[PDB]
Design a protein around this ligand. Structure first.
Ligand SMILES: CC(C)C(=O)Nc1cccc(C(N)=O)c1
Length: 185
């Protein structure tokens, strides 16, 4: 792909984080802690899942960023509306304001309703995410496989400002402790 010149510097918003997440000083990495991280509760925090938002809000233009997923067993990545539900149980779908892909149990899937099987021959260590606000497009790229396309959501109805979206996943297995990292430009 040729989207690299739309690169944006994403940072994580501590206030939106599930209370078990540990965000690095530079706000560029996040991992699951083994306990509550001693923060107060607030209406922005995702309560049920290990999720956090980027601080940046997008309402126009073309944006690109990259995320490192090395050695993780489970994660979700993409964008979401600023006004997505934070509390309780919900599914990741465009109807609920999410445009995402994930890894779960050795398979990759796009967060459509119902979910769509992805076809990835080279398991990615870094994911590229491209948003074209005006066109209504969110695309995902396999940086480990020379930028090959993973999935395109088209005809997106964003219906609000967008934020970068992250889920580090649970670590019930002891094999999913590794962080998500925002990769340098
Ligand atoms: C920051 C203060 C003013 C607040 O709102 N707290 C709070 C904490 C947990 C749940 C809720 C809630 N869901 O009402 C509200």
């Amino acid at each position: 792909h040729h989207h690299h010149h739309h690169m944006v510097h994403i940072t994580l918003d501590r206030n939106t984080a599930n209370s078990w997440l540990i965000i690095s000083k530079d706000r560029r990495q996040v991992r699951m802690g083994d306990t509550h991280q001693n923060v107060s509760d607030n209406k922005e925090r995702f309560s049920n899942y290990p999720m956090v938002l980027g601080a940046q809000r997008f309402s126009s233009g073309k944006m690109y960023w990259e995320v490192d997923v090395t050695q993780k067993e489970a994660w979700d990545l993409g964008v979401c509306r600023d006004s997505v539900q934070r509390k309780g149980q919900f599914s990741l779908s465009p109807e609920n304001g999410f445009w995402t892909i994930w890894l779960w149990q050795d398979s990759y899937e796009a967060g459509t309703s119902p979910q769509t099987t992805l076809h990835i021959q080279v398991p990615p260590c870094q994911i590229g995410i491209f948003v074209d606000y005006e066109a209504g497009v969110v695309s995902f790229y396999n940086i480990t496989d020379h930028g090959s396309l993973i999935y395109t959501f088209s005809e997106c109805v964003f219906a609000g400002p967008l934020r970068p979206f992250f889920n580090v996943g649970f670590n019930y297995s002891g094999g999913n402790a590794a962080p998500l990292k925002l990769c340098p430009l």
